[PDB]
Curated annotation (Swiss-Prot), chains A, B:
Section of the entire sequence shown: 108 to 572 of 575
Membership in a protein family: Belongs to the glycosyltransferase 23 family.
Catalysed reaction equations from the record: N(4)-{beta-D-GlcNAc-(1->2)-alpha-D-Man-(1->3)-[beta-D-GlcNAc-(1->2)-alpha-D-Man-(1->6)]-beta-D-Man-(1->4)-beta-D-GlcNAc-(1->4)-beta-D-GlcNAc}-L-asparaginyl-[protein] + GDP-beta-L-fucose = an N(4)-{beta-D-GlcNAc-(1->2)-alpha-D-Man-(1->3)-[beta-D-GlcNAc-(1->2)-alpha-D-Man-(1->6)]-beta-D-Man-(1->4)-beta-D-GlcNAc-(1->4)-[alpha-L-Fuc-(1->6)]-beta-D-GlcNAc}-L-asparaginyl-[protein] + GDP + H(+)
Role summary: Catalyzes the addition of fucose in alpha 1-6 linkage to the first GlcNAc residue, next to the peptide chains in N-glycans.
Name of this chain's protein: Alpha-(1,6)-fucosyltransferase
Effect ascribed to mutating S357A: Loss of enzyme activity
Length: 460, 460
């Protein structure tokens, strides 16, 4: 047992006791207060709780690193990656291309860059699940006409061709048992659905993942994003100098505002969490200058942000073409900015965005491959992580709830709870499957139900 | 790295995030509320926070046991005990009694049972520190006239005699270098003070202790209480049947009310913490019937308690003499009840009392020898643990404080803070030694400064 581990463990425990004492004390003061006075007292109270909880989180952070835990987690994540990539790399590059089981994916889905990327990932997952080499059809692609491989490595080194002895539309793995080249439609209408969809995870990989990762579901998706998104050497060198040119430097927080009464929306709502996290980082390292990478479809916002937060240094893709003239010929450059935004977002120490946005989900999924466990490394102003087309996202009720209003669901330990969302206010919304009722419950009383599937193992 | 360890660690971390979300949310609701309505909302809020923090504490508890941590802690505590006791046992029983370095302690100090017991412990600590066999003078002892050894084992098996070639009053270890039998006065006036006092701890034992124990200071004191308090076989058998007769059965909470505007005092104030802990225990085991051992100098209270808390089963030393008539001749039986109260208190799963009370401090010190780490296993309505005559109890400021009123002290990380007390409300009172100022600070912003002394090691 580690010295620091036990010190940290008790300081966490005593930090929460102290918090709880301070809580009931100052809460009993608030009961005897009147408008004006009650205001000042509640904000000071909040101020003070802020720092207090930050001290608990900081201890939890230190605890996650002590007996070489940090190093172990790093070697173990690095490990599972090298593993899953080898497996992918294997499947992708067979010897006899002409005779190899294939699954065919078409890129040009009627939707934005992130949306298409996920469609490939989705084809990719099912390929891997079904033991077929992914073949990627990217001809006349809105972003780079000239093919996917004008921007990123080919998805194969030894089998990029569509051909084969027979060719069906997807009709179920067992039925296509014997079709050498299956053609896969978009998820939206896929009408024998295969088990290989999010948010499940390979049965053979689960123990290891749960041990290393806050959300194996996203970690799994991120393996396919990882393989795909390998850059052509020109893309690499453009990234490096945009890094230089824009000044992008750690520590940085990614903010992504997807635009055109209401509020999960105005800039302040984003910057609330940026400040909180920056405060938190300041407990464990010196923050020289507070850095944000702002990604928006709105040029008016970067001027406003700089005004409202003169504390903060904002950094943005302002670039009006690639670094070398040559390259604007490769890409129809709404794509330049999207590649760079996603890059720099995924690269940041923390990410504040709106998960209902494809782009932000890509940034987060990439992020997962940049650290041992960056599952908790975001704040989204609406959705929890999801993947378009996933099977139902289910939770397990861990403690009893008795509703205090009828807008809330009851539950019992064990209850399967279909979660629609978290409200970032102590409450989540979802369905009590046992009861066929939908309402609020407190987010703490429930626990993530991890889904697994018997994927092919590929022993090489 | 353990599977459960990492699950628990993240659930602790996510439990506090959820708490913090719920906090700022419901706190912003409270700002817009008016008397009547504001009341109901604050109490429901408190109700709900209660359970929420209990879920965090319960996880911390489970975390303290996972990768065999519980077993390890148990073997390691058991170990240090066997060690320190061997060392004590050695020193206490030399071969040549007539020629052995001795230190002489007189029991009949002008104060109650606990008070005298600590005086012995104090002589005992200094004996051990100075490499002298403790000789205990207990002739005409208010509690058992006939000697200490009428109730407890002799403090030695082979050297109970006062004699020797020379005999001084304590005058400093280096000066008494050569006096074979030193005579030690009460602490209150001890005028070359030796390093061997609470709340310091043996330098050779510290790493191990901090690893295993929430408060090595009390653990250390408890080693001497342990050796002392070994019972004569008759005492043992009386305890066993009083256990039977009174129904004393786990789980039980010790409550001790030392009596004869104000309130750290009425029974409700005690039972608030009893309920809270019972609630907490109910998260990790089934509570059949909620059991309290009430120890009071007030016979009117046991009737009242039973009335006010019909939920609870109360258990008390009602006995009007020992089990076997014979034994009332051994002891002047204000002592029967004190031995039993202390016993049953020290034996409980949790202890609510008033630390300004000698008896309760003995119960707590004994408790430390009944489990791997029961340092956090109490709630005192006034003092923190102390030992009468200890050197100054010092803390180290761990985070910055800027005072919001002038009744509060500022501090900087590093500041040595002489702690007078904790107010059990998020705040502690003490002195900023750097600043020679005394006021309140938040209990979380500071950290226990562990004191160590180069004790004799006794390699046997």
């Amino acid at each position: 047992l580690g010295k620091d581990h036990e010190i940290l463990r008790r300081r966490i425990e005593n930090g929460a006791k102290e918090l709880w004492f301070f809580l009931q004390s100052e809460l009993k003061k608030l009961k005897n207060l009147e408008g004006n006075e009650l205001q000042r007292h509640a904000d000071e109270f909040l101020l003070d709780l802020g720092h207090h909880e930050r001290s608990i989180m900081t201890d939890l952070y230190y605890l996650s690193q002590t007996d070489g835990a940090g190093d172990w987690r790093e070697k173990e994540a690095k490990d599972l990656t090298e593993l899953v990539q080898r497996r992918i790399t294997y499947l992708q590059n067979p010897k006899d291309c002409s005779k190899a089981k294939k699954l065919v994916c078409n890129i040009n889905k009627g939707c934005g860059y992130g949306c298409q990327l996920h469609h490939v990932v989705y084809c990719f997952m099912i390929a891997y699940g079904t033991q077929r080499t992914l073949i990627l059809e990217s001809q006349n692609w809105r972003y780079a006409t000239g093919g996917w491989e004008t921007v990123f490595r080919p998805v194969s080194e030894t089998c990029t061709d569509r051909s084969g002895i027979s060719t069906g539309h997807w009709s179920g793995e067992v039925k296509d048992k014997n079709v050498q080249v299956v053609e896969l439609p978009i998820v939206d209408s896929l009408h024998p659905r295969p088990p290989y969809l999010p948010l499940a995870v390979p049965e053979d990989l689960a123990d290891r993942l749960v041990r290393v990762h806050g959300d194996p579901a996203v970690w799994w998706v991120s393996q396919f994003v990882k393989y795909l998104i390998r850059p052509q050497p020109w893309l690499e060198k453009e990234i490096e100098e945009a890094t230089k040119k824009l000044g992008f430097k750690h520590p940085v927080i990614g903010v992504h505002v997807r635009r055109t009464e209401a509020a999960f929306h105005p800039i302040e709502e984003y910057m609330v969490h940026v400040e909180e996290h920056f405060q938190l980082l300041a407990r464990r390292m010196q923050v020289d200058k507070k850095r944000v990478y702002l990604a928006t479809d709105d040029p008016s916002l970067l001027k406003e942000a700089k005004t409202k937060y003169p504390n903060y240094e904002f950094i943005s893709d302002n670039s009006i073409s690639w670094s070398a003239g040559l390259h604007n010929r490769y890409t129809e450059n709404s794509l330049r900015g999207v590649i760079l935004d996603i890059h720099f977002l995924s690269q940041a120490d923390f990410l504040v965005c709106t998960f209902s946005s494809q782009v932000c989900r890509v940034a987060y999924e990439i992020m997962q491959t940049l650290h041992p466990d960056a599952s908790a490394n975001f704040h989204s102003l609406d959705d929890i992580y999801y993947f378009g087309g996933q099977n139902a996202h289910n939770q397990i009720a861990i403690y009893a709830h008795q509703p205090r209003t009828a807008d809330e669901i009851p539950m019992e330990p064990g209850d399967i709870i279909g979660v629609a969302g978290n409200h970032w206010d102590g409450y989540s919304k979802g369905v009590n499957r046992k009861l066929g009722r939908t309402g609020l419950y407190p987010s703490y009383k429930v626990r993530e139900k991890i889904e697994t599937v018997k994927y092919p193992t590929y022993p090489e």
